[PDB]
């Protein structure tokens, strides 16, 4: 029988080509989105367009370390992420060009930091974030969409960002569901990075079956609900195909997203700049 969830209730949604016929077994994987909105809140003149997103993007590495090292103190079961997340071994034998851009061995975890192998030093030695991000754009879901977790126009990583608020996402694939561990992770992230007036829903799991000058402020609204719904249809099948995983006769379970809000100050926004981007922009 399908896995049991008490507080978060079930919901079904198959993309076209009580209990539906296909909702029988356990899902191929659960999807957990940590949705991050960030801003350099005290803005100034003399800041360049790049300063809108470089400093916010530099926090993805610390955020990923925090998620990966999270342990449920006082646990009655699953303790760490490694005990619960989906394990991947090797990309397809063809398509190895995405080595050091997608996780081969271990936990399935995607984030913008993957563009730099989750290496803050490599990010700091990078003079053109836009070029690095778009280096592999051409169909199936793009590498930028896979790593950012958002359509791409919502991200705000561009030279024409007027609101100066950048959003991205960390994507976790989980083999098992643990209410205690997942609630602990959400509580940890909301303690570390409180969101001002976040109203995201947190009580529904969506099962998807695939057939064949002034200060800026971070806002949370109905446009941020079920953000994954504005990704491509082939997003998840294409993500899982890279690891020889098929969603043909099976389904996945998307859990409610965990909000995160980052406020950065001019000191960090300055300390992060690569000296060679001042001359260009």
């Amino acid at each position: 029988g399908p896995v049991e969830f008490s507080t978060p209730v079930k919901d079904y949604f198959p993309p076209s080509p009580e209990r539906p016929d296909w909702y029988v077994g356990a899902p191929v994987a659960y999807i957990q989105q940590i949705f991050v909105k960030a801003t350099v809140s005290p803005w100034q003149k003399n800041f360049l367009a790049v300063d809108v997103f470089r400093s916010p993007l530099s926090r993805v590495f610390q955020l990923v370390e925090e998620i990966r090292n999270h342990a449920l103190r006082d646990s009655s079961g699953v303790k760490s992420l490694e005990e619960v997340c989906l394990q991947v071994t090797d990309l397809l034998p063809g398509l190895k060009k995405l080595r050091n851009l997608l996780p081969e061995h271990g936990c399935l975890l995607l984030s913008p930091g993957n563009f730099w192998q989750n290496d803050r030093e490599r990010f700091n030695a990078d003079p053109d974030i836009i070029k690095t991000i778009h280096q592999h754009e051409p169909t199936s879901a793009t590498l930028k969409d896979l790593l950012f977790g958002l359509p791409g126009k919502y991200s705000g990583v561009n030279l024409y960002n007027r609101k100066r608020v950048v959003s991205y996402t960390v994507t976790l694939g989980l083999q098992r569901y643990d209410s205690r561990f997942l609630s602990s992770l959400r509580s940890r992230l909301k303690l570390l990075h409180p969101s001002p007036n976040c109203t995201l829903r947190e009580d529904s799991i969506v099962h998807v079956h695939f057939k064949e000058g002034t200060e800026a402020e971070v806002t949370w609204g109905a446009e941020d609900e079920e953000i994954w719904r504005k990704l491509s249809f082939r997003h998840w099948p294409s993500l899982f195909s890279y690891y020889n995983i098929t969603l043909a006769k099976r389904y996945i379970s998307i859990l409610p997203a965990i909000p995160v809000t980052l406020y950065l100050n001019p000191q960090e926004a300055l300390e992060v700049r690569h000296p060679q981007e001042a001359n260009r922009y």
Partner: antibody
Framework: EVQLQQSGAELVRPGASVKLSCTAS????????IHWVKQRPEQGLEWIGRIDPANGHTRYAPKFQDKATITADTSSNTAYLQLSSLTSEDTAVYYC?????????????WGQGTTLTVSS | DIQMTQTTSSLSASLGDRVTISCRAS??????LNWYQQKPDGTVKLLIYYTSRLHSGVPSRFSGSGSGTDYSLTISNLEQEDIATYFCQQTNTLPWTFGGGTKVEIKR
């Protein structure tokens, strides 16, 4: 409306065994851990242990590993703490509580407290 | 394992006065400190969690601050209802440890 009703005051002989009880109302004990705390004047409060009623998985402070035994009945919505090999040093007030946030681990709601007296 | 110590076991104050309780941890606890209030009746009630966060229903005159090893609760204006004992509990390392309570009383 969350309440944790506790049993009445207890008087027992040294060497006997007591079972204090704590009945929840307004929520199901299955949904949270249930903890027992001990207040003793001139020593303050100290943590005894907790139980996860969904799993029946208990944990204790190392002081009470051989002293306390925590259990829970979900049908009756009641947690229990059993003290064994009682001595005078077990005369104290025992609080039943829980927590609701699983990173902060704050005890949001408490029972009124049960006084246990051990005297010949 | 972690020993929490409150400097003053008793404190005398007056209505409308600013009061401050403080406690020190034997080691870093990464802001995992909760503040509880116990009435003379014996009923306990959570005041603060994670060193600054107000529990729902707590009057806004209570506040918390601190870091590293040193933490402090503050009552902006002592009300007649704020006569009680105050405990600080650390939830950083697994066996939860409370600090010896600090009593608050009127001047006499």
């Amino acid at each position: 409306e969350v309440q944790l009703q506790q049993s009445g005051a207890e008087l027992v002989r040294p060497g006997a065994s007591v079972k204090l009880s704590c009945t929840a109302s307004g929520f199901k004990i299955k949904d949270d851990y249930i903890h027992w705390v001990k207040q003793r004047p001139e020593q303050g409060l100290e943590w005894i242990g907790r139980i996860d009623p969904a799993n029946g998985h208990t944990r204790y402070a190392p002081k009470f590993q051989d002293k306390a035994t925590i259990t829970a009945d979900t049908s009756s919505n009641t947690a229990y703490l059993q003290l064994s090999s009682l001595t005078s040093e077990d005369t104290a007030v025992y609080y039943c509580t829980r927590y609701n946030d699983y990173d902060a681990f704050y005890f949001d709601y408490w029972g009124q407290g049960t006084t246990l007296t051990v005297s010949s | 394992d972690i020993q929490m110590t409150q400097t003053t076991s008793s404190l005398s104050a007056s209505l409308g006065d600013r009061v401050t309780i403080s406690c020190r941890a034997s080691q870093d606890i990464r802001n995992y400190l909760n503040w509880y209030q116990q009435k003379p009746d014996g009923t306990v009630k959570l005041l603060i969690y994670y060193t600054s966060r107000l529990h729902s229903g707590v009057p806004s005159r209570f506040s918390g601050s601190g870091s590293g090893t040193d933490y402090s609760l503050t009552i902006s204006n002592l009300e007649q209802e704020d006569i009680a004992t105050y405990f600080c509990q650390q939830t950083n390392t697994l066996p939860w440890t409370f600090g010896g309570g600090t009593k608050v009383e009127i001047k006499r």
